[PDB]
Design an enzyme around this catalytic site. Structure first.
Site, PDB file in Angstrom:
ATOM      1  N   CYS A  52      65.095  58.401 127.142  1.00 30.81           N
ATOM      2  CA  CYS A  52      64.893  57.298 128.042  1.00 30.81           C
ATOM      3  C   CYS A  52      64.930  57.784 129.485  1.00 30.81           C
ATOM      4  O   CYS A  52      63.938  57.529 130.173  1.00 30.81           O
ATOM      5  CB  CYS A  52      65.955  56.244 127.757  1.00 30.81           C
ATOM      6  SG  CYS A  52      65.949  54.725 128.752  1.00 30.81           S
ATOM      7  N   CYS A  57      62.076  55.029 128.933  1.00 26.04           N
ATOM      8  CA  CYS A  57      62.299  53.854 129.760  1.00 26.04           C
ATOM      9  C   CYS A  57      62.142  53.918 131.273  1.00 26.04           C
ATOM     10  O   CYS A  57      61.403  53.145 131.890  1.00 26.04           O
ATOM     11  CB  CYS A  57      63.683  53.316 129.563  1.00 26.04           C
ATOM     12  SG  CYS A  57      64.429  53.677 127.969  1.00 26.04           S
ATOM     13  N   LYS A  60      58.539  55.314 132.492  1.00 30.67           N
ATOM     14  CA  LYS A  60      57.442  54.406 132.159  1.00 30.67           C
ATOM     15  C   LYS A  60      57.562  53.189 133.022  1.00 30.67           C
ATOM     16  O   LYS A  60      56.541  52.713 133.487  1.00 30.67           O
ATOM     17  CB  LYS A  60      57.457  53.992 130.656  1.00 30.67           C
ATOM     18  CG  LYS A  60      57.310  52.514 130.157  1.00 30.67           C
ATOM     19  CD  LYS A  60      58.727  51.957 130.029  1.00 30.67           C
ATOM     20  CE  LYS A  60      58.921  50.679 129.253  1.00 30.67           C
ATOM     21  NZ  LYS A  60      59.228  50.940 127.867  1.00 30.67           N
ATOM     22  N   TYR A 198      54.287  49.353 121.308  1.00 29.44           N
ATOM     23  CA  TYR A 198      54.528  49.075 122.701  1.00 29.44           C
ATOM     24  C   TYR A 198      54.187  50.289 123.548  1.00 29.44           C
ATOM     25  O   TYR A 198      53.501  50.114 124.541  1.00 29.44           O
ATOM     26  CB  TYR A 198      55.992  48.604 122.905  1.00 29.44           C
ATOM     27  CG  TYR A 198      57.112  49.608 122.925  1.00 29.44           C
ATOM     28  CD1 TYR A 198      57.685  49.964 121.732  1.00 29.44           C
ATOM     29  CD2 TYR A 198      57.561  50.167 124.102  1.00 29.44           C
ATOM     30  CE1 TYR A 198      58.714  50.889 121.727  1.00 29.44           C
ATOM     31  CE2 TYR A 198      58.586  51.093 124.094  1.00 29.44           C
ATOM     32  CZ  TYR A 198      59.156  51.455 122.897  1.00 29.44           C
ATOM     33  OH  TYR A 198      60.131  52.438 122.801  1.00 29.44           O
ATOM     34  N   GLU A 202      51.569  49.905 126.661  1.00 24.81           N
ATOM     35  CA  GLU A 202      52.153  50.139 127.986  1.00 24.81           C
ATOM     36  C   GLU A 202      51.401  51.243 128.646  1.00 24.81           C
ATOM     37  O   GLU A 202      51.021  51.058 129.811  1.00 24.81           O
ATOM     38  CB  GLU A 202      53.589  50.574 127.948  1.00 24.81           C
ATOM     39  CG  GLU A 202      54.421  49.447 127.441  1.00 24.81           C
ATOM     40  CD  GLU A 202      55.923  49.695 127.446  1.00 24.81           C
ATOM     41  OE1 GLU A 202      56.368  50.819 127.501  1.00 24.81           O
ATOM     42  OE2 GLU A 202      56.733  48.784 127.357  1.00 24.81           O
ATOM     43  N   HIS A 461      63.586  24.513 139.500  1.00 21.28           N
ATOM     44  CA  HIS A 461      62.164  24.299 139.685  1.00 21.28           C
ATOM     45  C   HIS A 461      61.777  24.831 141.048  1.00 21.28           C
ATOM     46  O   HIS A 461      62.552  24.497 141.958  1.00 21.28           O
ATOM     47  CB  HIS A 461      61.992  22.793 139.534  1.00 21.28           C
ATOM     48  CG  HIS A 461      60.661  22.214 139.861  1.00 21.28           C
ATOM     49  ND1 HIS A 461      59.562  22.275 139.133  1.00 21.28           N
ATOM     50  CD2 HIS A 461      60.375  21.544 141.011  1.00 21.28           C
ATOM     51  CE1 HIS A 461      58.596  21.668 139.797  1.00 21.28           C
ATOM     52  NE2 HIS A 461      59.103  21.241 140.920  1.00 21.28           N
ATOM     53  N   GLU A 466      61.835  27.459 133.400  1.00 23.63           N
ATOM     54  CA  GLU A 466      62.183  26.051 133.182  1.00 23.63           C
ATOM     55  C   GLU A 466      61.350  25.423 132.073  1.00 23.63           C
ATOM     56  O   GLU A 466      61.651  24.329 131.610  1.00 23.63           O
ATOM     57  CB  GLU A 466      61.998  25.200 134.435  1.00 23.63           C
ATOM     58  CG  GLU A 466      60.601  24.960 135.003  1.00 23.63           C
ATOM     59  CD  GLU A 466      60.540  24.054 136.240  1.00 23.63           C
ATOM     60  OE1 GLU A 466      61.220  23.018 136.274  1.00 23.63           O
ATOM     61  OE2 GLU A 466      59.799  24.357 137.177  1.00 23.63           O
TER      62      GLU A 466
END
Ligand SMILES: Cc1cc2nc3c(=O)[nH]c(=O)nc-3n(C[C@H](O)[C@H](O)[C@H](O)COP(=O)(O)OP(=O)(O)OC[C@H]3O[C@@H](n4cnc5c(N)ncnc54)[C@H](O)[C@H]3O)c2cc1C
Ligand SMILES: Cc1cc2nc3c(=O)[nH]c(=O)nc-3n(C[C@H](O)[C@H](O)[C@H](O)COP(=O)(O)OP(=O)(O)OC[C@H]3O[C@@H](n4cnc5c(N)ncnc54)[C@H](O)[C@H]3O)c2cc1C
Lengths: 487, 486
Positions: A52, A57, A60, A198, A202, A461, A466
């Site tokens: 990672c 991680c 990337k 993924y 990615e 909001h 929401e």
């Protein structure tokens, strides 16, 4: 001593380093961590800090952050930002250099860690087993190389991670994998990502932002839709959003043969017969447990067919003082899971606080453009576990995007409930900020939230999240596995 | 019996919830009154309310636009080359795009009334003649033409709030957020008077769209901006505001404002400081807009400042007159107004009495960077519990090592009752904290304790995963007293 070390860790990655440092720092154990290299990059790629930190991680994400600027600079025009649009250009070499200083910064911090944690030591070389109480540090992966060190230990933790999977095909050696992707000196004008996972998606986004102006990025994948294992409406809409930004998604496609052309480009002929030509062909088809050079049969540790070291709830193997964590145990290959198992191991073994890691309701993100955040079961899974399943859905184009011109950017959230008692069994979304929104949703799912808990919270909001608080009515159901519409 | 079941005065966030649910769900005759049908001058608000027209929706669009200044700046670190001296923000194009978005919402509401049987829109100033008669007139003037009269069983007053003015001379030359949305040019020198979310939000919008030699000053009386929020976050946000170019002036208040020959305004500060600005925007507070409704002839009680006094169920001292939203001055945010409108319709026409929980309401400030906040501030929590523990983190995201905006620290602070570990308040500063807080509020309504946060596995790499990473308190408030050792 009566055992020179308390614990020898093989793998200074996500779990390995967590384990190593807490056992030493918190518990005053003498811990030796072994890894192949002290700084990122070739020949080994991973180094201190693990996959990672070095080729995973962290790089990337910077590279996806860089890629996202193709869309925000385009998008500023609708809010009034005038600039010479013709002058805009990406510079791949500028990206890799900043990523390289960021990642080497981390590498340097880890050295400092070992420097001031009494009892913690870095040992460099290839770790291999002699017996359950002796770990060898060798010069190469080859069983015959010079052994540099022989560590006598009480406990052995094996945290060696994963490695990229390959295709059996003719030409595989002319293909790179994500490891090399990080170090390319020029961005491909045309690139083929193969795989539907993924890492493939990615990387398709990164190449797409940084390609030269007549470039093209193709993603080829064997299946019907990419991202198997994810929500299928989300997988259909991410394929459309990907397509809308120019990636050519070619499903039911698999490389057959890769050949080097005169100029250097590779020539791929697909099993369909179709053939094309790319600068880069990057294989991202799978990640395999990296157990094969450890000589686990010397200590008698059992492994699965695919190489996964078999472990119990507490990560212990069939040899009582050997535990294993992270990707090599093949459970959930995500960093925060490796770290957690890393920590549960020290509580169990050295802190007599025996924890088992919970691998259920683990959230994860895909940092595609636009990204996804997902947690819990997919409705087809839920439909064969529960009797009555309700699926709530919501779709919208952030108003922003009617001004920025990327009207294709639908934010989408799908909540899956057990309709008998309303408990939320899964929450799936596509759209910006979804990596960030899903973190706290996983906190709700570990607590046992019901959909009532969600629609009774007053929303903040104007936000995308929401929507979570406005899905009061089911959209359709599954009465005993069958898609029903009233239950 | 009466001609109408309900007459809603104010077709805003609260009142459109109340009128459409009573008509569409309960089959009532609802008459909804508002001053105009489209956003804009002269009344600014219109059908849809302050949020749709001169509030949340436009402002958020204008903040999103302001933000491209930072992202085109920051793109250089990731290898995007651009002719950076050609970048010019265009205000008129921003306002137009905004105006096109708001007008389309206004036209939704045309459609809604067209197909909900029983709901109608009546246009003018609504005022009360008695507790069953509402009068729609041409203007606020009591002696203006009565355009129509409505006879009704219940009345709901959802009239909102309006900018608070400063009594100083020259106050007639200051604008407020109403006119800020309709300005023709970006101001090059702007003064934003007020330490609150609207002031800070507009200062950030003006900072990004001003002409190259310009300056935004943010003036406030108090010691630190954003009264009511966590102090550490108020402290941190001011630096990041300064770091993007805002001259933040605390302990300052305009004393007098005059006009100059070129129509720039000249402000004499209470400090004796003096300065000229293109625009002076007073954003010092919002006051309940109850004053033109002739509440007195229906016998309705208002508070000192003008809030209509209402009980838990939004009922006034007059049995068939309710009031919801900003005018009651409980929590002046849109989802609360909406929530009270649905509770009222359950209490009166469904006879399922509900009352709105105004307690754990999450809110965001769309400043650059933004804030997401929910629950108790440690000073308040320490007044109520005698063992509070405060946890906190801040980190600069790696992205910002590379972008150069190294002042951008993400920060999260969790306040708990140390006795049981219940989480009383979560306060975050940094990008995406508006989004992250929405789901934190769900946790907080369900009673999450701190071990629920840290027993969850993180989503890496994200800022949100820091929420799950705080196992140790930084200090405590033992019996009101701060202590770091209990
Ligand atoms: C491109 C890519 C993207 C990813 N993105 C994410 C993401 O965003 N988030 C996320 O959670 N996960 C992500 N991951 C996965 C994450 O990297 C892993 O889950 C995590 O690093 C696994 O931790 P680990 O402890 O199992 O091993 P690792 O960090 O893989 O530790 C492996 C370590 O063992 C060493 N080693 C191997 N054999 C030996 C030996 N014989 N002797 C000594 N040392 C040895 C490796 O050199 C060394 O670095 C990604 C991975 C890739 C490749
Ligand atoms: C600049 C600004 C930014 C904001 N940002 C946010 C944000 O991001 N998020 C958030 O939640 N909240 C925000 N708010 C607050 C939010 O706008 C209000 O809390 C909310 O709209 C109030 O709801 P309401 O139903 O009480 O009244 P309103 O929505 O204000 O509705 C008022 C209605 O009453 C009408 N009216 C008044 N008197 C009469 C009369 N005599 N006769 C007829 N019509 C009359 C007004 O013309 C009309 O539109 C913001 C407010 C402002 C002004």
């Amino acid at each position: 001593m009566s055992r020179a070390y308390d614990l020898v860790v093989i793998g200074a990655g996500s779990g390995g380093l967590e384990a190593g440092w807490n056992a030493a720092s918190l518990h005053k154990k003498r811990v030796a961590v072994i890894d192949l290299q002290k700084h990122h990059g070739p020949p080994h790629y991973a180094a201190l800090g693990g996959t990672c930190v070095n080729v995973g991680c962290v790089p990337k994400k910077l590279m996806v952050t860089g890629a996202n600027y193709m869309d925000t600079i385009r998008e500023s025009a609708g809010f009034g930002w005038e600039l010479d649009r013709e002058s805009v250009r990406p510079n791949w070499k500028a990206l890799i250099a900043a990523k390289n200083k960021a990642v080497s910064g981390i590498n340097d911090s880890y050295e400092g860690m070992f420097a001031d944690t009494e009892g913690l030591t870095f040992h460099q070389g290839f770790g291999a087993l002699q017996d359950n109480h002796t770990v060898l540090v060798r010069e190469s992966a080859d069983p015959n190389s010079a052994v540099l060190e022989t560590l006598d230990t009480e406990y052995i933790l094996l945290a060696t991670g994963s490695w990229p999977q390959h295709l059996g095909i003719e030409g595989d050696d002319l293909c790179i994998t994500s490891n090399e992707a990080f170090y390319l000196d020029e961005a491909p004008k045309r690139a083929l990502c193969v795989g539907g996972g993924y890492i493939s998606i990615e990387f398709a986004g990164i190449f797409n932002a940084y390609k030269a102006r007549g470039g093209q990025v193709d993603l080829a994948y064997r299946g019907d839709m990419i991202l198997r294992g994810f929500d299928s409406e989300l997988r259909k809409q991410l394929t459309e959003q990907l397509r809308a930004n120019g990636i050519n998604v070619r499903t039911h496609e698999n490389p057959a043969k890769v050949t080097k052309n005169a100029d250097g480009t590779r020539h791929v002929v697909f099993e369909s017969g179709a053939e094309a030509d790319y600068d880069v062909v990057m294989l991202a088809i799978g990640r395999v447990p990296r157990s094969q050079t450890l000589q686990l049969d010397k200590a008698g540790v059992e492994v699965a067919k695919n190489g996964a070291i078999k472990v119990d709830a507490y990560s212990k193997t069939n040899v009582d003082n050997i535990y294993a964590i992270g990707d090599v145990t093949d459970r959930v290959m995500l960093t925060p899971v490796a770290i957690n198992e890393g920590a549960a191991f020290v509580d169990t073994v050295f802190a007599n606080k025996p924890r088992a890691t919970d691998h259920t309701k683990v959230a994860c993100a895909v940092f595609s453009i636009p990204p996804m955040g997902v947690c819990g079961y997919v409705e087809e899974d839920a439909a064969k576990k529960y009797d009555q399943v309700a699926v709530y859905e919501s779709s919208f184009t952030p108003l922003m995007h009617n001004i920025s011109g990327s009207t294709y950017k639908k934010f989408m959230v799908r909540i899956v409930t057990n309709h008998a008692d309303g408990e939320v069994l899964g929450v799936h979304m596509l759209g910006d900020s979804s990596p960030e929104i899903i973190q706290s949703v996983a906190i709700c799912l570990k607590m046992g939230a019901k959909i009532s808990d969600f629609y009774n919270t007053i929303g903040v909001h104007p936000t995308s999240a929401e929507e979570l608080c406005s899905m009061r009515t089911p959209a359709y159901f599954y009465q005993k596995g069958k898609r029903v519409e009233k239950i």
